Design a protein around this ligand. Structure first.
Ligand SMILES: C[C@@H]1O[C@H](O)[C@@H](O)[C@H](O)[C@@H]1O
Ligand SMILES: [Ca+2]
Ligand code: NI
Length: 143
């Protein structure tokens, strides 16, 4: 049971690198449109262990992180073999979940057990592959 407010929206975002103009802030712009050509999907270099991060700006009790995959050009499978990580204000890991695949689905819902975190990170574990996210949404645990 989570709150409805997407607390990642408009927050400071960063990523390992930026390519094809795929600014990290596109994942927190309030637009889940997954077509790259519509300018709301991020893109890093083709590199090893690409990552993307949002800073929630303070410590929040997180219950759910929802990822929206890229949908055009059939390169959806680049979001595979990845971690979703929650960090504290000191940037130490407080939670981590591993996923093989989204299995063709446009989105993934990730449920955390009432974790107090300031940062949310997506980390690819794969070589020479870019990280592209249409959107990352984060919701507080319902109190
Ligand atoms: C933005 C570009 O989109 C194309 O469809 C891909 O083939 C390229 O690899 C790159 O990701
Ligand atoms: Ca977006
Ligand atoms: Ni179009």
């Amino acid at each position: 049971p989570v709150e409805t407010e997407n607390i990642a929206r408009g927050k400071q975002a960063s990523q390992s690198s930026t390519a094809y103009g795929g600014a990290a802030t596109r994942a927190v712009d309030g637009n889940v449109d997954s077509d790259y050509g519509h300018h709301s999907v991020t893109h890093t270099n083709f590199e090893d262990n690409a990552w993307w991060q949002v800073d929630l700006g303070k410590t929040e009790n997180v219950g759910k992180v929802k990822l929206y995959n890229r949908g055009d050009g059939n390169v959806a499978n680049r979001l595979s073999n990845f971690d979703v990580v929650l960090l504290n204000e000191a940037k130490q890991e407080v939670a981590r979940q591993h996923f093989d695949s989204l299995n063709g689905k446009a989105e993934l819902e990730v449920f955390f057990t009432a974790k107090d975190a300031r940062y949310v990170k997506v980390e690819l574990k794969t070589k020479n592959t870019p990280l592209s996210l249409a959107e990352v949404e984060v919701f507080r645990s319902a109190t």
